[PDB]
Amino acid sequence: VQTLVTLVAQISETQYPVDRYLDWIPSLRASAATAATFAEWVNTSMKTAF
Amino acid sequence: NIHLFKQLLNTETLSVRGANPLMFRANVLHMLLEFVLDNLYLNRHTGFSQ
Structure with a gap:
C-alpha cells in the first residue's frame, strides 16, 4: 500500500x-480509470515477484 | 414543407401543394404542442473515458 x-x-x-523526481517526464492528468489500470499493473508485479 | 401546415383542418383543401392560411394558427399550435410532448424525457448517465 505504501508502494x-x-x-x-x-x-x-x-x-x-x-x-x-520525474516531473520533467511528460505525462497526462491521470483520472480514476487510468490510475486503476496503473495500479493493476503495479499489483501483479508485486505478486509475481513474491 | 407545406404538408405540416395543412394537417389540422384542411379537410376541404383539394390540391396537395396548397393549404388554407386561415388555419395557420391552429396548425402552429398543434405543432408546438407535439414539439413539447416529444421532448418529455429524463437525461440518462451513460459513462465516460479519459
Missing part, C-alpha cells in the same frame, strides 16, 4: 506529501 500510494501520487494530484 502504491507513493507511485500513484506521482501521476495525479494527491495531497500525500512526496518529493517528486
Whole structure:
C-alpha cells in the first residue's frame, strides 16, 4: 500500500506529501480509470515477484 | 414543407401543394404542442473515458 500510494501520487494530484523526481517526464492528468489500470499493473508485479 | 401546415383542418383543401392560411394558427399550435410532448424525457448517465 505504501508502494502504491507513493507511485500513484506521482501521476495525479494527491495531497500525500512526496518529493517528486520525474516531473520533467511528460505525462497526462491521470483520472480514476487510468490510475486503476496503473495500479493493476503495479499489483501483479508485486505478486509475481513474491 | 407545406404538408405540416395543412394537417389540422384542411379537410376541404383539394390540391396537395396548397393549404388554407386561415388555419395557420391552429396548425402552429398543434405543432408546438407535439414539439413539447416529444421532448418529455429524463437525461440518462451513460459513462465516460479519459
